[PDB]
Amino acid sequence: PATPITTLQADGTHLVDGYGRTVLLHGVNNVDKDAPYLPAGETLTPQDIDILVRHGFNTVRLGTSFDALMPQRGQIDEAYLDRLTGVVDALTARGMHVLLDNHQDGLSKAWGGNGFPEWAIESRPREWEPNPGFPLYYLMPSLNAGWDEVWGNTHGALDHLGTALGALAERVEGKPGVMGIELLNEPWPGSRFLSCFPNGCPDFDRTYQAAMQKLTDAVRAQNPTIPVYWEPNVTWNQMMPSNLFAPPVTPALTTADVVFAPHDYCIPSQLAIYLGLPQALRGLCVPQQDLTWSNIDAITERANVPTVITSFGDGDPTVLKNTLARADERFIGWQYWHFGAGNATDPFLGEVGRQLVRTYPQATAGEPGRMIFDADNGDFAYRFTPRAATRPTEIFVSDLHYPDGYAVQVDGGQVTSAPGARIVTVVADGSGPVTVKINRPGSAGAEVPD
Ligand code: NA
């Protein structure tokens, strides 16, 4: 008898469910970048969804796009919206919190990318201008001129995008499992991007923040309560800090339920995948990714809003621990790139899945304390401080790490679930801290960090 899914509400840095519990989201991306969008029989199947549930994932970052929503000037595609809501409903029915990702790469299909419809952008690449494809096409002069049209609202591109996202927001209004709308994937600053280096671009971030606020206000005009997810400008991915929410340079947030949505990629990993550069350069992933996490801490400290890592990984098993361990340190959730529809085999049964599939507290009837998971042998420890909630703490137990079953110990509380349950339920004895250990029966287990 599964716990009915609820809306999530940001309370400082916490996402809190309808039962008063603090939620940790671990899941995947599923994004359709080419017309026709979400066509019959090419979306996530019940077998796909069974795979996600089996491995205890509780979120999907589901792609949409301006092009999908408004493929002709001023004309919402209501049929596309039917198809999208069908996928959303399928996911939320199985306990997945769905984040609607307004996706783009390279601005538009004019450049071989996706996201903004071609009718909305005037700029076009010339026949003689080199196009290196993703990701280096962000250096093309015509693609930069396109971005300038966006941030200058030269031809009303953001006004139309506001209409599109407003229509989406209206369509999903009232659905508790919709965790929000992510306003724009990887926003690129355009022609003056060199102002972001080597230490960020406060003036651009003022422009960007105002655009995100305008979009947020348009969304909220049609759906007053839906959470909105704001990415940093994408020079973030080249180690640059964000200047969002940094008065007096940029405004303090005065809008409820805004969540920070950064990505966490290793540059040399991505360069090896897309350019064929030496894989051994990934020697630098650890220190470079540590820089990203430090940039996240700065936002957390200054703005006091939640963070979800909305994209990371991209098939490289060597880099995952850098995200996973640092996210666990901060009790921050995440969505892995990428999970395709129509899987003929479970793609989580190898090295990537060994790390992504974890024992973890999906919802805590308390304030989270420190947590560790050992992805080699399944050792798990977690401490938290109880607060009153209307449901118990629920901890998903990896279906991969315990081939002879699992043992659970709780200090300061009790296990109320059956032996071998997929979900461990824990009720606190009192006001004092609760410590949960889960491990293989013969293991001495993990210790709570610090
Ligand atoms: Na498609």
Rounded to the nearest angstrom, the distance between the alpha carbon of 105 and the centre of ligand 1 is 15
Rounded to the nearest angstrom, the distance between the alpha carbon of 38 and the centre of ligand 1 is 6
Name the 3-class secondary structure at 108: strand
Neighbours of 420 (CB within 10 A): 9
Neighbours of 130 (CB within 10 A): 9
Which resolution in angstroms does this entry have? Answer: 1.9
| Lookup: tokens for 44 | 């996530």
Rounded to the nearest angstrom, the distance between the alpha carbon of 230 and the centre of ligand 1 is 25
Residues in the chain: 450
| Lookup: tokens for 332 | 């921050």
Neighbours of 137 (CB within 10 A): 20
What residues contact 8, with CB distance under 8 A and at least 6 apart?
15, 16, 17, 23, 97, 179, 227
Name the 3-class secondary structure at 95: coil
What is the C-alpha to C-alpha distance for residues 426 and 365, in angstroms, rounded to an integer? 9
> What is the gyration radius of the CA atoms in the chain, in angstroms?
22
Rounded to the nearest angstrom, the distance between the alpha carbon of 60 and the centre of ligand 1 is 18
Rounded to the nearest angstrom, the distance between the alpha carbon of 232 and the centre of ligand 1 is 27
Rounded to the nearest angstrom, the distance between the alpha carbon of 214 and the centre of ligand 1 is 29
Measuring CA to CA, which residue among 260, 138, 249 is closest to residue 193? 138
Q: Where along the chain do its domains lie?
A: 21-357, 358-450
What residues contact 181, with CB distance under 8 A and at least 6 apart?
99, 100, 102, 165, 168, 169, 219, 226, 227, 228, 229
Range list of H helices, 228-333:
267-275, 285-303, 320-330
Instruction: State which approach was used to obtain the coordinates.
Output: X-ray
Rounded to the nearest angstrom, the distance between the alpha carbon of 31 and the centre of ligand 1 is 9
Contact 390, 19 (CB under 8 A): yes
Which residues lie at CB < 5 A from ion ligand 1? 32, 34
Rounded to the nearest angstrom, the distance between the alpha carbon of 112 and the centre of ligand 1 is 15
Bond prior to 262 in cis (omega within 30° of 0): no
Q: HSE (CB half, 13 Å, CA atoms) of 78?
A: 1
What residues contact 99, with CB distance under 8 A and at least 6 apart?
59, 60, 61, 62, 179, 180, 181, 182, 229, 308, 310, 335
No. of helices (H) and no. of strands (E), the chain: 10, 21
What is the C-alpha to C-alpha distance for residues 389 and 1, in angstroms, rounded to an integer? 19
Contact 411, 393 (CB under 8 A): no
Q: HSE (CB half, 13 Å, CA atoms) of 17?
A: 27
Rounded to the nearest angstrom, the distance between the alpha carbon of 341 and the centre of ligand 1 is 11
Question: Under CATH, what is the fold of the domain 358-450?
Answer: Immunoglobulin-like (2.60.40)
Q: Is domain 21-357 annotated with CATH 3.20.20.80? A: yes
Rounded to the nearest angstrom, the distance between the alpha carbon of 32 and the centre of ligand 1 is 5
| Lookup: tokens for 62 | 């589901």
